[PDB]
Structures are given as structure tokens and as C-alpha cells.
Design a protein around this nucleic acid. Sequence first.
DNA 1: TAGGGTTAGG
Length: 183
Amino acid sequence: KEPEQLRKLFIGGLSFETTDESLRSHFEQWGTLTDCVVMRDPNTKRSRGFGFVTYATVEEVDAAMNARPHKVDGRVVEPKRAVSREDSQRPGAHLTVKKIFVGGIKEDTEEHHLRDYFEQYGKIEVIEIMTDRGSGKKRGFAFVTFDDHDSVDKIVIQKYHTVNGHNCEVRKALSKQEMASAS
DNA sequence: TAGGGTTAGG
């Protein structure tokens, strides 16, 4: 079926008392769970305050994210699309942000090209195709802001994105300082 | 609130 990575959600901010079972009890309400686990320190067996749930289908994952906010064992938790272990090493991979950087877009790209691809992921708030202040020339990248951080997360976990007929690279937007800090 | 003994010899 769909890849395990795209069927899984990271659940952060779990109460100290949530266990594999109480977690499953909550999330099974949105579909069939193929995996459900609270992460624990190997040594002291104590909860690390986070876990994962994996559904049989991405559509169930989507259903669960459409049901936010989630309260598990009396605490509002923070479900997020699961970012792969390799991608988790990149700067800002786990940031909650509503904006993405879209790089490598053709000179004739227009806003409608960005909408036709990105509106299927969520409600768009702002689209900025960047130009050099001063020369007025296109720089080949844009920013797109959405109303929900999950739209960004669901887009960046996918590998390819076709805008104005060709692939473009999409990453979470890091600020000017964050880019420096990741240098 | 970022992963479960889950990542480079011919």
C-alpha cells in the first residue's frame, strides 16, 4: 500500500502517563492502527514524552490530523507528520512553520502556477515570487504561506513537486538568521 | 515533543 513513513504521525507532548495502550485507544478512533508506541528511555524505562501512531492508510492519517486538537490522557498533544530519520538531520526539519521555500522555479512562473500545485494541500494565505530589489530580475524561488502548518508538513515529506511544468525543491522556510545559524 | 538493538568485501 502506501509507504509506512507517510502512514505515520509523531505525537509529541504526551502526558507522563500515556502508554502504548492509552495512545492506541485514542487514535484508533480515526482508523486502523498498524503501529502505536510510546518511546521510552531504554535504561530507566521511563516515557520520553512522545510516540508514533501509524494508520493503514494515509487517508486515515489525514482524518486524524483533521481532528485536531487531540487530548490524550487529559493532555493536549502535538501530532505531526512523521519526518524520516534521514530528513530529521536537516536544519529546521521539525519546525512548526506555515511557510515554504520553493526553489528552482522557471522565470515565467506565475502565481497561478504555484496555486494549481499547492492549493490541493491547504488554504494558501500568501504567495511571493522573489525578484532582486533593484535589478527587478527573477531569482528563481518563491515563498508560499498556508493557514495550517500541517499543509507545509504534508508537502515537505513528499519528494517531488511539479510547478509550471517542472520539478521544484520545497523546504520549510527558515528565516535569515536560521539560515545563518545552519551555516 | 524526533524513533523501537534502524544506516557503508570483493
